[PDB]
Amino acid sequence: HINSVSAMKLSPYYKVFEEDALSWEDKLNRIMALFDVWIDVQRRWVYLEGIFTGSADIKHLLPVETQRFQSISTEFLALMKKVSKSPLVMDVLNIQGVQRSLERLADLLGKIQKALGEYLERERSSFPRFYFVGDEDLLEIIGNSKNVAKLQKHFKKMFAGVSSIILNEDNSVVLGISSREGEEVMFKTPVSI
Amino acid sequence: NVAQYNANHPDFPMQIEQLERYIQRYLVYAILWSLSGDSRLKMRAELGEYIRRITTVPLPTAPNIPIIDYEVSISGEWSPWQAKVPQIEVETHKVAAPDVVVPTLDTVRHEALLYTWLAEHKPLVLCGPPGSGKTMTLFSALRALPDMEVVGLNFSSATTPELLLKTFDHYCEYRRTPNGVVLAPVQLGKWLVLFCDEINLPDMDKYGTQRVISFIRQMVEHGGFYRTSDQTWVKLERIQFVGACNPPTDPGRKPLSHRFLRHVPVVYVDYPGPASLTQIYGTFNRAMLRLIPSLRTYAEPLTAAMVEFYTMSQERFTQDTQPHYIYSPREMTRWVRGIFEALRPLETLPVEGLIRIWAHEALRLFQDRLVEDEERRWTDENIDTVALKHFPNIDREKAMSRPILYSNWLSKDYIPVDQEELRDYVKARLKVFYEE
Amino acid sequence: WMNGLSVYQIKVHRKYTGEDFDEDLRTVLRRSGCKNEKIAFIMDESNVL
Amino acid sequence: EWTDGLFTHVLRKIIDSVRGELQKRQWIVFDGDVDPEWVENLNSVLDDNKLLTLPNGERLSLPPNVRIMFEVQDLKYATLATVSRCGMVWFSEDVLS
Amino acid sequence: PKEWIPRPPEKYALSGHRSPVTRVIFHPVFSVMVSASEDATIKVWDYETGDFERTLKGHTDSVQDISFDHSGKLLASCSADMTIKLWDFQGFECIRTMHGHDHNVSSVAIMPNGDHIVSASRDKTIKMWEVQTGYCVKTFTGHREWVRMVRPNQDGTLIASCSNDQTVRVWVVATKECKAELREHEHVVECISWAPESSYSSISEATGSETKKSGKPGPFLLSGSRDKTIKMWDVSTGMCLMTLVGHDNWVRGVLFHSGGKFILSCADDKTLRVWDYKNKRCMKTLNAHEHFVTSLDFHKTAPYVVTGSVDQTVKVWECR
Numbered sequence A: 001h002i003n004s005v006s007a008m009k010l011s012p013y014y015k016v017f018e019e020d021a022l023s024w025e026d027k028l029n030r031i032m033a034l035f036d037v038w039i040d041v042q043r044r045w046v047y048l049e050g051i052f053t054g055s056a057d058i059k060h061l062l063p064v065e066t067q068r069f070q071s072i073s074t075e076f077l078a079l080m081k082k083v084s085k086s087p088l089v090m091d092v093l094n095i096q097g098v099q100r101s102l103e104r105l106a107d108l109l110g111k112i113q114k115a116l117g118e119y120l121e122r123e124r125s126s127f128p129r130f131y132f133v134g135d136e137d138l139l140e141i142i143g144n145s146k147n148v149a150k151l152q153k154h155f156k157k158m159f160a161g162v163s164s165i166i167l168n169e170d171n172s173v174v175l176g177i178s179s180r181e182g183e184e185v186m187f188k189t190p191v192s193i
Numbered sequence B: 001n002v003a004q005y006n007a008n009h010p011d012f013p014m015q016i017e018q019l020e021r022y023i024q025r026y027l028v029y030a031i032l033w034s035l036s037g038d039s040r041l042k043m044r045a046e047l048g049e050y051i052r053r054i055t056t057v058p059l060p061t062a063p064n065i066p067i068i069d070y071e072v073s074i075s076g077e078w079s080p081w082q083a084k085v086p087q088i089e090v091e092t093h094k095v096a097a098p099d100v101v102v103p104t105l106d107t108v109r110h111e112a113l114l115y116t117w118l119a120e121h122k123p124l125v126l127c128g129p130p131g132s133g134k135t136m137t138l139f140s141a142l143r144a145l146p147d148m149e150v151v152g153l154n155f156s157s158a159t160t161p162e163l164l165l166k167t168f169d170h171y172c173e174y175r176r177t178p179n180g181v182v183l184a185p186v187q188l189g190k191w192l193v194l195f196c197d198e199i200n201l202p203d204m205d206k207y208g209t210q211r212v213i214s215f216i217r218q219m220v221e222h223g224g225f226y227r228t229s230d231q232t233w234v235k236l237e238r239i240q241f242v243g244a245c246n247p248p249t250d251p252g253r254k255p256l257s258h259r260f261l262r263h264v265p266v267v268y269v270d271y272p273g274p275a276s277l278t279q280i281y282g283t284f285n286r287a288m289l290r291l292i293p294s295l296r297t298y299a300e301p302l303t304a305a306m307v308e309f310y311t312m313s314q315e316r317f318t319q320d321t322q323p324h325y326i327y328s329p330r331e332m333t334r335w336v337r338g339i340f341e342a343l344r345p346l347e348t349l350p351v352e353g354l355i356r357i358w359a360h361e362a363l364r365l366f367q368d369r370l371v372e373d374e375e376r377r378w379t380d381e382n383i384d385t386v387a388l389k390h391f392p393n394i395d396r397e398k399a400m401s402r403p404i405l406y407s408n409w410l411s412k413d414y415i416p417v418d419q420e421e422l423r424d425y426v427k428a429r430l431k432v433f434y435e436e
Numbered sequence C: 001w002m003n004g005l006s007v008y009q010i011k012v013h014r015k016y017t018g019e020d021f022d023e024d025l026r027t028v029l030r031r032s033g034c035k036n037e038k039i040a041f042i043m044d045e046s047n048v049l
Numbered sequence D: 001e002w003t004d005g006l007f008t009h010v011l012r013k014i015i016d017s018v019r020g021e022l023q024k025r026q027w028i029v030f031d032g033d034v035d036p037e038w039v040e041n042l043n044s045v046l047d048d049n050k051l052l053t054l055p056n057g058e059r060l061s062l063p064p065n066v067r068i069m070f071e072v073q074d075l076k077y078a079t080l081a082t083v084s085r086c087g088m089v090w091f092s093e094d095v096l097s
Numbered sequence E: 001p002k003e004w005i006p007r008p009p010e011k012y013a014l015s016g017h018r019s020p021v022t023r024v025i026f027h028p029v030f031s032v033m034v035s036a037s038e039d040a041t042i043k044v045w046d047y048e049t050g051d052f053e054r055t056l057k058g059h060t061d062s063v064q065d066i067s068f069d070h071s072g073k074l075l076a077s078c079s080a081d082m083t084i085k086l087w088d089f090q091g092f093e094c095i096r097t098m099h100g101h102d103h104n105v106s107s108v109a110i111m112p113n114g115d116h117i118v119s120a121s122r123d124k125t126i127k128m129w130e131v132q133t134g135y136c137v138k139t140f141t142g143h144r145e146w147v148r149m150v151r152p153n154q155d156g157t158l159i160a161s162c163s164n165d166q167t168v169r170v171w172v173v174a175t176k177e178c179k180a181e182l183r184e185h186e187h188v189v190e191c192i193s194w195a196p197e198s199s200y201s202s203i204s205e206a207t208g209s210e211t212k213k214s215g216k217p218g219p220f221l222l223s224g225s226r227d228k229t230i231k232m233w234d235v236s237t238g239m240c241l242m243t244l245v246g247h248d249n250w251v252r253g254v255l256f257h258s259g260g261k262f263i264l265s266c267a268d269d270k271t272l273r274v275w276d277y278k279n280k281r282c283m284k285t286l287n288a289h290e291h292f293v294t295s296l297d298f299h300k301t302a303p304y305v306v307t308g309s310v311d312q313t314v315k316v317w318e319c320r
Ligand SMILES: Nc1ncnc2c1ncn2[C@@H]1O[C@H](COP(=O)(O)OP(=O)(O)O)[C@@H](O)[C@H]1O
Pocket: B100, B101, B102, B103, B129, B130, B131, B132, B133, B134, B135, B136, B137, B244, B272, B280, B329, B330, B333, B334
């Protein structure tokens, strides 16, 4: 849509439709910016919620961090409930304070992600092969432990020829080991995830 | 109110005969309050009996109590104000909190009148002696309106409109509209209430005018004020004014101009008097004497003692002797709060100890203010005799003494302290304090 | 000193205009509200100009 | 804690492909002089490993759609370990007329 | 065993001093003790016999703190004349006078390594000294007011401090500073003390805490209240595990028991308090002196508690 608007802006009778073209372009740029921030903040929040809910005994070691993320998560839950109650693109575009609220949420989630180095080092001590995984990628791996959808793009860093793994329909039993050229080996007995 | 009834009862609309019987009674009630709201109880009773004696409107069959004691119910019949609020039992935790208000006849009546005048966003002025309750009444009647947000303002002798302009710069914003400039609070959908606390005290000029009162009158009547920076008329959007003031016969106060006073209704709040005071603080005393169950029976005599000594001191020391001789229910509230704070950590105390706390608080409230040794001796002797009058068969020597001191320095709690031990402790602490 | 408050005196002098009192009040308010510091603000009658 | 640079940030963005940079044809072009200070860091990328190694132990495998390009004027300071890993397109002075 | 508590009356009431007694400590290897007062002297007392042994003149103003080393052959004393002296306790003579502070030095200690000395003075700075040379090597800043006491931890890697700044500040010695800043005291912070190694289990089971599950339970501080309280803290940014309300005046000295099962405390209420901190209550109260009690110490092996006071007397309490 933005490309088409910019194409018809140049030629040939743009002068009569100028104000409508500017309004269209402005609202398109605004929704582009809002959703560009939105995809990143949702991608951050999904693994932050995973790591702070599925993993336990973190409040006894980072109480202020856990309380801060609990408050931020309740705020995000309320905002997403409002978005669910207003599923219109124009409505979410014109929600008052959405841009600054989402920018502040991105900044706070970034700070929370930054303040996790000691816990990440403890996890790396727990599993030896996590030493070859970065901080953000390790955070995503821990947060999306139950999902098992983003582990296929991270297994190649940990292992030698294990590019990905094959799963069942329930996505709760590992069936084998898959390489990057399609060569696969079948387990003698699976693992009970 | 009729429209509210119509909205609340969609299946049964507002009938004509009920509307007539409601509106006639409300007209009598509104005439009474609008014409004698700024006068004493005797004068409003006189106006009520005059209306009852001249005008043929149905009225309650009240042999003694005035018509202003009654409320026009929405169903169209008179209802007493006293039956609205019963005896309440405030919790021990908030026994003298700054926001607790134990309901009373005058409190409920003034709250209803304030709500009526504040729902229409009409400016008003609360008049009465200091400490009578003209800020608790406004705040209690305005806590029932979530739309309203209070902004405190304390007028002085050298008050000039720049105080109002600084308040507007902080709490509101200027915006430009095609119709002109309007001024509105930054909180969207909220009404701002400016509570000017000493509205008489702005200094009257040589030619009988007050700049602040003229400014407020211009804003109330013309709906806006000129902005002196660019000489541009600035309109107001959601702003009202509420004034509190002592009577204009007080030593520092001046009478407001008639052009300003044309717009602001004035309601006169007086001191509660003895019969209201005894209940209005016996509730607090009964709540307070639950920390120590053995002191439960010593609540009515204690409240009578506080009320009686406060009345005696207020009658004795007046404004004409010294400028600061102002005694109000603020002193009783601080009395209850002091006894509660001295009783909270103890949870075991005999009646002599309770009387000692009561006498120490009486001293610290009614004797530190005084100037002359004769007045101080009068307060000491009268504290002793009021305590002996209201508390017979008590250990006078064990409950009263010449020093009577309380401190939390030598003890963890707030318990009485011996003078010699206190002197030794202060000497040692001064030895430490010289080097620090 | 016994109660742990920090004593503040404005230390008035000559040519002490209203801006200096505003600055002293600002510093007292900042210390007392932003930094949770209990302050005893002792002010004399000769300090009022 | 690790702070990314320009090349590492761009490569990590392409690897993550949050907005779908993997599907497009991505080219990384180095428009500057070549010396063994910073190209011996990239010799593992230009090697058969297709891999960038960092002091963390974090490794970033080069995706097949990304070509590492240099727009250089000369190679008088590059070493054999750099020249031997890349394909040469000698743009002579007579190519442009 | 691990249960003895001081009992009335006192064993000896040693009264050789001339001014208020400031700090009293025990000896690591010998059956002797030293005491510092405000008359610029450090008397040495045999607490087993109860007789004054010898004095250590040399300080110009009131000596404010004293501390032995691990071997027991060195005594480090700091005074209000802005100097720190190191005493050769084998021959009872001063080795070096170490200037450098700008005001009254309030407390010193010798690190468990044995060749470094900490300090604390009214200029809000903490300095590290060299025992071998006498030079200053490291200075700590961050406190906004008079620093009253400094205490290194068990292995010498961490330093805790208390100040008129209303705060307790603990940091690592080596390179980083301000590991935590503890701000739950509403008045001045006066007396800190670390927790001994044989106290972590009792502390963990006494306070609200899970069954470890983290490893290295973390160091624990103690009190420092001029607001008549006792407060112990934790690892990281620090939280108040418990507050032992029940005291009467300005707390001046706090300790753990040798077995780690009790908290000993003394204050200006002329009272030595024995806290059963597992139940957050004081189970024993000793009317120690006739004036303010300034300091106490607890013997690591022998059953003796010693207290100094403004009474110009040093009392030794035998434990039963
Ligand atoms: N129920 C009550 N009735 C009357 N006075 C009360 C009541 N509760 C508290 N007070 C005291 O009455 C005082 C009235 O002061 P305030 O509300 O500021 O009005 P004013 O502006 O007349 O002083 C308050 O300080 C309060 O302590």
